[PDB]
Design an enzyme around this catalytic site. Structure first.
Site, short mmCIF file in Angstrom:
data_model
loop_
_atom_site.label_atom_id
_atom_site.label_comp_id
_atom_site.label_asym_id
_atom_site.label_seq_id
_atom_site.Cartn_x
_atom_site.Cartn_y
_atom_site.Cartn_z
N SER B 26 49.14 1.26 12.38
CA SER B 26 49.78 2.41 11.78
C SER B 26 49.77 2.47 10.27
O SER B 26 49.10 3.29 9.70
CB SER B 26 51.22 2.42 12.25
OG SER B 26 51.96 3.35 11.51
N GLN B 27 50.52 1.60 9.62
CA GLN B 27 50.55 1.59 8.18
C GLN B 27 49.27 1.05 7.62
O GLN B 27 48.79 1.52 6.61
CB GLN B 27 51.71 0.75 7.66
CG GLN B 27 53.07 1.14 8.17
CD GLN B 27 53.56 2.46 7.64
OE1 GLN B 27 53.35 2.79 6.51
NE2 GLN B 27 54.24 3.20 8.47
N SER B 52 40.60 -3.69 16.64
CA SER B 52 40.72 -2.89 15.44
C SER B 52 39.54 -3.04 14.45
O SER B 52 39.40 -2.20 13.56
CB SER B 52 42.02 -3.23 14.72
OG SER B 52 43.10 -3.33 15.63
N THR B 83 56.80 -10.56 14.34
CA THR B 83 56.90 -11.84 15.05
C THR B 83 55.60 -12.63 14.99
O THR B 83 55.59 -13.80 15.31
CB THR B 83 57.31 -11.64 16.55
OG1 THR B 83 56.65 -10.49 17.11
CG2 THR B 83 58.81 -11.45 16.68
N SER B 84 54.51 -11.98 14.58
CA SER B 84 53.22 -12.61 14.32
C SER B 84 53.02 -13.13 12.87
O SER B 84 52.09 -13.89 12.62
CB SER B 84 52.09 -11.59 14.60
OG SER B 84 52.19 -11.06 15.90
N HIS B 107 58.07 -4.55 5.21
CA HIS B 107 59.42 -4.78 5.72
C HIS B 107 59.80 -6.22 5.34
O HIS B 107 58.96 -7.12 5.43
CB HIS B 107 59.41 -4.64 7.24
CG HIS B 107 60.74 -4.86 7.91
ND1 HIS B 107 60.85 -5.42 9.17
CD2 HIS B 107 61.99 -4.52 7.54
CE1 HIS B 107 62.12 -5.44 9.53
NE2 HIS B 107 62.84 -4.91 8.55
N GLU B 194 68.06 1.13 12.91
CA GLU B 194 67.30 1.21 14.17
C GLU B 194 68.19 0.89 15.35
O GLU B 194 68.06 1.48 16.41
CB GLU B 194 66.10 0.25 14.16
CG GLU B 194 65.00 0.64 13.18
CD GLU B 194 64.03 -0.48 12.77
OE1 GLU B 194 64.09 -1.59 13.36
OE2 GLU B 194 63.19 -0.25 11.85
N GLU B 230 67.68 20.12 23.36
CA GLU B 230 68.33 20.76 22.22
C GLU B 230 68.65 19.85 21.04
O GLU B 230 69.13 20.33 20.02
CB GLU B 230 69.57 21.53 22.70
CG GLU B 230 69.22 22.77 23.54
CD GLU B 230 70.43 23.50 24.11
OE1 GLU B 230 71.58 23.13 23.80
OE2 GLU B 230 70.24 24.47 24.86
N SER B 251 77.03 27.88 16.72
CA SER B 251 78.15 28.81 17.01
C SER B 251 79.47 28.17 16.68
O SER B 251 79.60 26.93 16.62
CB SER B 251 78.15 29.20 18.47
OG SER B 251 78.55 28.12 19.29
MG LIG Z 1 64.35 2.36 9.26
MG LIG Z 2 61.25 -0.72 10.80
MG LIG Z 3 76.51 27.01 22.87
MG LIG Z 4 73.70 23.87 23.21
#
Ligand SMILES: [Mg+2]
Ligand SMILES: [Mg+2]
Ligand SMILES: [Mg+2]
Ligand SMILES: [Mg+2]
Ligand SMILES: NC(=O)c1ccc[n+]([C@@H]2O[C@H](COP(=O)([O-])OP(=O)(O)OC[C@H]3O[C@@H](n4cnc5c(N)ncnc54)[C@H](OP(=O)(O)O)[C@@H]3O)[C@@H](O)[C@H]2O)c1
Ligand SMILES: [Mg+2]
Ligand SMILES: [Mg+2]
Ligand SMILES: [Mg+2]
Ligand SMILES: [Mg+2]
Ligand SMILES: [Mg+2]
EC number: 1.1.1.86
Lengths: 327, 325
Positions: B26-27, B52, B83-84, B107, B194, B230, B251
């Site tokens: 990812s990063q 990769s 952990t690696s 991190h 998290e 929602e 509302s």
């Molecule tokens: Mg965070």
């Molecule tokens: Mg994180």
């Molecule tokens: Mg409502």
């Molecule tokens: Mg609602």
């Protein structure tokens, strides 16, 4: 459960009815335009001496008063604030109804809790799309739609089912799927979701998370990032693919941590407190408080809002967000 | 709490460095591509016969062993999984860290909990973008950036803040604002976030809300909509303005509902349980459980995942999403 599509609906039915939209908010606005595009003659009902009256004129709609539009119409869709609706019914709607008129709702609160009690020979039904007005409109405009719940509370003629489906079909809900439900079910599931999870539970989770960190000596701005700002990624991922999808896309550290600590925050007693929230909705306690608050001039809500949004996460969130719109 | 920007950063600093990216997920893929367009000589360091390696080569990168890459480089950004990292440091990184080299992380976990203890004369810093890899990549291409945290655990050189800020600029963070912090503060806030709120809190709250409606006899699909589908519009609202944007836009029944009932769901006992979760992070107990999971084959995590995934909310949502936007 059941799913209804264009093929199941009869558009010729609502096409053959004069419809009045009472309200021109987000829903009112989308319904009116979609109905119009679907072949329905529609009039907006308003205070005719109003901001909205002229916005509605400018979008091409004939506009009459609430009383005149109800009189004019075969179908009356009432899309005003949940708390204005009893007064609006008694004074401006009830007195102009014919027998055989349909009175329709976006939400089931006033009917399920008996704040509105129409005569037996009136049809009472509900069309509640699952998205705000702008999306109901945009989805409609490009040949798609937003799924709707429908329900019938009074069916004196035996045509209410087909009339509420025809309406939902005209606003594009039969493209995605129309879900028949009940006034009771729609109403208590919605209020519950809002109280337990969406509005109440979420907002307090993030506030209190922000407080624990802040009280432990970490800077508010750090706290706003790790507790509110990053919540949108998490929730976008859940919207796209559910919890399984969120857990797949975060680091294993986040995911493992989520699994150990989430049910420590939301534990068995939390679940019982939610059950009591639900009972309180089902037996009218909540709705009693709701009307008490209106009939006392909306003081409790205004007091709650004033202090509940007076939180350091709102002071800190606004500084940082203002700094990020500034690019 | 200063926000740092392009005018504060000397980009020539990381331009004059050899950068190893260890890990290409990812990063990794995004940091990697952004540095390269900011004029940095980048190499990717991967384990012997990694999957990769094909992705990285096809994206134009010299790919090496982690140890060859560590040797070539001045700056080594470590983005393998948490952990690696200790083992990768002991086997392939530590042996090629020389006075003036810098070890970077995304991190602070390994540094803060003493899983990795670099020698005195090594720069130890962090550049943690506030957003996902793909977003870090695309934001940079469209002339923008994702905000970054930066920190410094070790600074023998006196250049460590400038070096991290340079790197952050080079990946786009200074365009959006870079927040200075510490290793301790990023580590613990992230983890607590998290655990208490983002992944743990939100998922159990929606899951438990769903159960409450299903056991009271409401159909699973109604419950799904009103508890999870929602949630996005609400959180989108909080993302844009704040909580008060959300309360302004719902509302008056929804707003009133939340005020009266939210604090019944999240009471003072909840606040204490959150302080407990915090304390388990600060004192290292969460870290040991993370290490234990992976020393026993990752089955605990695999079982907990399975338990979550075979929850009716998952069956139900999958059904309902198939009717898509
Ligand atoms: Mg965070
Ligand atoms: Mg994180
Ligand atoms: Mg409502
Ligand atoms: Mg609602
Ligand atoms: O951060 P995140 O965990 O969220 O990122 P992530 O998306 O899980 O990616 C982690 C990256 O670290 C690499 N990696 C794992 N073990 C390694 C080792 N011993 N030496 C070198 N590279 C290794 C992985 O490559 P592989 O594809 O080789 O596992 C992967 O590209
Ligand atoms: Mg009439
Ligand atoms: Mg009744
Ligand atoms: Mg994973
Ligand atoms: Mg070297
Ligand atoms: Mg309001």
């Amino acid at each position: 459960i059941e799913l209804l599509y264009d093929a199941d609906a009869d558009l010729s039915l609502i096409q053959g009815r004069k419809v009045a939209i009472v309200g021109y908010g987000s829903q009112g606005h989308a319904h009116s335009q979609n109905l119009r595009d679907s072949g329905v003659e529609v009039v907006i009902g308003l205070r005719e001496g109003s901001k909205s009256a002229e916005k509605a004129k400018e979008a091409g709609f004939e506009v009459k008063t609430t009383a005149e539009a109800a009189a004019w119409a075969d179908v009356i869709m009432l899309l005003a604030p949940d708390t204005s609706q009893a007064e609006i019914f008694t004074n401006d709607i009830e007195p102009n109804l014919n027998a055989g008129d349909a009175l329709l709702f976006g939400h089931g609160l006033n009917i399920h809790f008996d704040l509105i009690k129409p005569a037996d020979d009136i049809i009472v039904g509900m069309v509640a799309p699952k998205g705000p007005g702008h999306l109901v409109r945009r989805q409609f405009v490009d040949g798609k739609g937003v799924p709707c719940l429908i329900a019938v509370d009074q069916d004196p003629t035996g045509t209410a089912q087909a009339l509420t489906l025809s309406y939902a079909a005209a606003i594009g809900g039969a493209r995605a799927g129309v879900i028949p439900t009940t006034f009771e079910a729609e109403t208590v599931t919605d209020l519950f979701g809002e109280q337990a999870v969406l509005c109440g539970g979420t907002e307090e989770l993030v506030k209190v998370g922000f407080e624990v960190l802040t009280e432990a000596g970490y800077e508010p701005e750090m706290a706003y990032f790790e507790v509110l700002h990053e919540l949108k990624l998490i929730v976008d991922l859940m919207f796209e693919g559910g919890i399984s999808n969120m857990n797949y896309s975060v680091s294993d550290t986040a995911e493992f941590g989520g699994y150990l600590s989430g049910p420590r925050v939301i534990d068995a007693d939390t679940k019982s407190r939610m059950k009591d929230i639900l009972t309180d909705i089902q037996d009218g306690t909540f709705t009693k408080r709701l009307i008490a608050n209106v009939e006392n001039g909306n003081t409790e809500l205004e007091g709650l809002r004033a202090s509940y949004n007076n939180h350091p996460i709102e002071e800190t969130g606004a500084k940082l967000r203002d700094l990020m719109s500034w690019v």
